[PDB]
């Protein structure tokens, strides 16, 4: 065995109720934050420079209908999905830095096949790839069932890259960005109620390009207020801005490190 086999969360889309998406979610977030380190309430992710290799990733387990499984590789510093493995194959995006790519050479050593794409994994570059805005792209409990399948037969021929992509990006959203944000969470676990297949609205793509900002504007916020109004979008596209944090407490579940915590207030 390796030194410590990182934490697994397994799931499956076989008999996917709302309950058991919920659960998914829970052990997700609750693998991710350190537990203490809460900023206004909003439990914030751990630092990436005291992190050892051992606490720096999070695998999820993915089963299909069809007996068919992919893990994927969370970073605990942001909930980035790093890479996945599919039968013997592990495949990791293009790192960013030296220090990421020092690490992701922890990520399934005992793999036979070993491959790191030349492009990165953030939303911009898939959407090249995939020939398509995520506004573009149903998530449900069908398409992830789709999407497992594509992952795992990119290592048996059937690729086509933007497929391969448009896959990627439907399991980071229903995955990463729904630990992320309970608010999304909502979105995904509506879908599954009534077994829709729809592409998320702007409320929850500004979200998703908001996160970061969110996080700093919390954790730079004067006891709560924010220092300046981060302007967010609405289901219909409109605009409007958030002045306080306590608005964004029971939708924003996850917070990316930003700030040191401050004269560390928890007990
Ligand atoms: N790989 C990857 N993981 C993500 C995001 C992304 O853009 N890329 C957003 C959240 N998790």
């Not at 573009?136 to 933007?162: D, R, V």
């Not at 908001?210 to 919390?218: E, Q």
Request: hydrophobic share 40%.
């Amino acid at each position: 065995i390796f030194p410590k086999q990182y934490p697994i969360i397994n799931f499956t889309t076989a008999g996917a109720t709302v309950q058991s998406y919920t659960n998914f979610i829970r052990a997700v977030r609750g693998r991710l934050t350190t537990g203490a380190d809460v900023r206004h309430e909003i439990p914030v992710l751990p630092n990436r420079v005291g992190l050892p290799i051992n606490q720096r990733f999070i695998l999820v387990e993915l089963s299909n209908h069809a007996e068919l499984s992919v893990t994927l590789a969370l970073d605990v510093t942001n909930a980035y999905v790093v890479g996945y493995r599919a039968g013997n194959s592990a495949y990791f995006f293009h790192p960013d830095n030296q220090e990421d790519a020092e690490a992701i050479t922890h990520l399934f050593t005992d793999v036979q096949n070993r491959y790191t794409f030349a492009f990165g994994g953030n939303y911009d570059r898939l959407e090249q790839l995939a020939g398509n805005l995520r506004e573009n792209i149903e998530l449900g409990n069908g398409p992830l069932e789709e999407a497992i399948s594509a992952l795992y037969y990119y290592s048996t021929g059937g690729t086509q890259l933007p497929t391969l992509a448009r896959s990627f990006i439907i399991c980071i959203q229903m995955i990463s960005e729904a630990a992320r944000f309970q608010y999304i969470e909502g979105e995904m676990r509506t879908r599954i109620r009534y077994n829709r297949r729809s592409a998320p609205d702007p409320s929850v793509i500004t979200l998703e390009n908001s996160w970061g900002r969110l996080s700093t504007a919390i954790q730079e916020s004067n006891q709560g207020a924010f220092a300046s109004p981060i302007q967010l979008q609405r289901r219909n596209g409109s605009k409007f801005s958030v002045y306080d944090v306590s608005i964004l407490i029971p939708i924003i579940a996850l917070m990316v490190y930003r700030c040191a915590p401050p004269p560390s207030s928890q007990f």
